[PDB]
Each structure stands twice: as C-alpha cells, then as structure tokens.
Amino acid sequence: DCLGFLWKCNPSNDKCCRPNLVCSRKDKWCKYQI
Numbered sequence: 001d002c003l004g005f006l007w008k009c010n011p012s013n014d015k016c017c018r019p020n021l022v023c024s025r026k027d028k029w030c031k032y033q034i
Contacts, residue, residue, distance in 0.1 A: 005031050 002017040003009065009016055009023030009030040016023055016030035024031045 003030050005029070 002021070003015045005021050007016070007030050008028060011023060011025075014023050014030075019033055021030050022033050023029075
C-alpha cells in the first residue's frame with residue numbers, strides 16, 4: 001500500500017501511489033491529482 005491522500009508527503013521519500021495520488025508542493029500532502 002502507500003501513503004494515502006491527506007497524508008503529508010516527503011519529496012525525498014515519496015511513498016504515495018503516483019501519479020493518481022501525488023505529493024503536493026501546494027497542499028504539502030499527498031493528494032489526488034485533480
């Protein structure tokens with residue numbers, strides 16, 4: 001599994017399900033790529 005959405009991401013340790021969910025530089029968390 002991965003880090004879900006609303007979970008703070010780490011650019012260097014991105015363990016989010018990309019590209020569906022992705023670390024947001026804007027939101028600072030992994031969010032959906034809306």
